[PDB]
Design a protein around this ligand. Structure first.
Ligand SMILES: NC(=O)C1=CN([C@@H]2O[C@H](COP(=O)(O)OP(=O)(O)OC[C@H]3O[C@@H](n4cnc5c(N)ncnc54)[C@H](OP(=O)(O)O)[C@@H]3O)[C@@H](O)[C@H]2O)C=CC1
Ligand SMILES: O=C(O)COc1cc(F)ccc1C(=S)NCc1ccc(Br)cc1F
Ligand SMILES: [Cl-]
Length: 316
């Protein structure tokens, strides 16, 4: 397959990127260096991951080494929930830029539709454990994102974890200046997301699939949870193609016209996960993988579920 997808800002985005959530700060610099050495040109980052400085060390070294040019990289980060305030968006973006050693981002996403009270804590709680909301809505936050484009800090803006009706609100915003380029959502065979994907694609938004391997390192994993990487039905498809289960799980979203961002800090796996451009899943394989949907999410959070903008009460 072709390696990049055209966005509605006119730029091209690599369809495979390296995820960095949970990548330890003492390992992520090497992970990103290895990734760039073996062909990755897209890194998915976020301020809340607490490792952007270390990701940036790698990016900067590979630019300095002239392994790559800046124009050939596609660096993504995300505005955390405690920075949904007109007066905080630019500084949040600029902190990310400073940490990543960059003068622009290729794509900057609203990480979640929910705004939280600003302050030092990423999840400010009341004494009963509910997240403390911000009164600032997704439309005013979007206008603040648009300003970043108009200041040259970011080349594209988008959204993440927005449900159908939240994407629609964005698209229906009075005075909308820039459409979202991307909606980054969880997507894998147990959470296939057909409805939200069709809605977004029909509107020209590119979808990025996160947790494509089912996030086995998620901190809240339980033993009885389903496991994509161990599912013998998926292992059988992999065996048939002489690929690993992870490689099937990465190729799957690619053939749905999605971008996909598997995370690893293991050099061998970083390389394995990139070797997904020389085989094709059949239509029958694709439909079979889709059939495994069970509406199972890695990323949900009870403390945020009353927030008026919490995204997953809607069907999609
Ligand atoms: N926008 C949002 O709200 C969210 C964004 N994301 C983004 O998506 C990225 C990917 O999702 P994430 O939840 O991290 O989980 P993934 O589904 O990418 O799974 C990562 C886990 O899979 C392991 N792994 C990686 N490659 C292989 C392989 N070839 N064989 C076996 N195991 C493998 C990793 O181990 P190891 O590292 O030890 O090799 C790690 O434990 C995140 O890192 C982040 O960048 C994720 C969640 C939410
Ligand atoms: O979010 C990430 O990218 C990956 O996950 C995280 C990454 C972090 F660095 C810190 C927390 C999370 C959590 S707990 N994320 C889930 C989550 C957060 C906020 C809301 Br609204 C709902 C929700 F489901
Ligand atoms: Cl963030």
């Amino acid at each position: 397959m072709a390696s990049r997808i055209l966005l509605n800002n006119g730029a091209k985005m690599p369809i495979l990127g390296l995820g960095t959530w949970k990548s330890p700060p003492g390992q992520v610099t090497e992970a990103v260096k290895v990734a760039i050495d073996v062909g990755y040109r897209h890194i998915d980052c976020a301020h809340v991951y607490q490792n952007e400085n270390e990701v940036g060390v790698a990016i900067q070294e590979k630019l300095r080494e002239q392994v790559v040019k800046r124009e050939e990289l596609f660096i993504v980060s995300k505005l955390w929930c405690t920075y949904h305030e007109k007066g905080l968006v630019k500084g949040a973006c600029q902190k990310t830029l400073s940490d990543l050693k960059l003068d622009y981002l290729d794509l900057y996403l609203i990480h979640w539709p929910t705004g939280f009270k600003p302050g030092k804590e990423f999840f400010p709680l009341d004494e009963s454990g509910n997240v403390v909301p911000s009164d600032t809505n997704i439309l005013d936050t979007w206008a603040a994102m648009e300003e970043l484009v108009d200041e040259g800090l970011v080349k594209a803006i988008g959204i993440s974890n927005f449900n159908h009706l939240q994407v629609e609100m964005i698209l229906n915003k009075p005075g909308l200046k820039y459409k979202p380029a991307v909606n980054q959502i969880e997507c894998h065979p147990y959470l296939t997301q057909e409805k939200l994907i069709q809605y977004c694609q029909s509107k020209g938004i590119v979808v990025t699939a996160y947790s494509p391997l089912g996030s086995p390192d998620r901190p809240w994993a339980k033993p009885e949870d389903p496991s994509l990487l161990e599912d013998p039905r998926i292992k059988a498809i992999a065996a048939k193609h002489n690929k690993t289960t992870a490689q099937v799980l990465i190729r799957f979203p690619m053939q749905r016209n999605l971008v996909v961002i598997p995370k690893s800090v293991t050099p061998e796996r970083i390389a394995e996960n990139f070797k997904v451009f020389d085989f094709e899943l059949s239509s029958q394989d694709m439909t079979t993988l889709l059939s495994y949907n069970r509406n199972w999410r890695v990323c949900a959070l009870l403390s945020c579920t009353s927030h008026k903008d919490y995204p997953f009460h809607e069907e999609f």
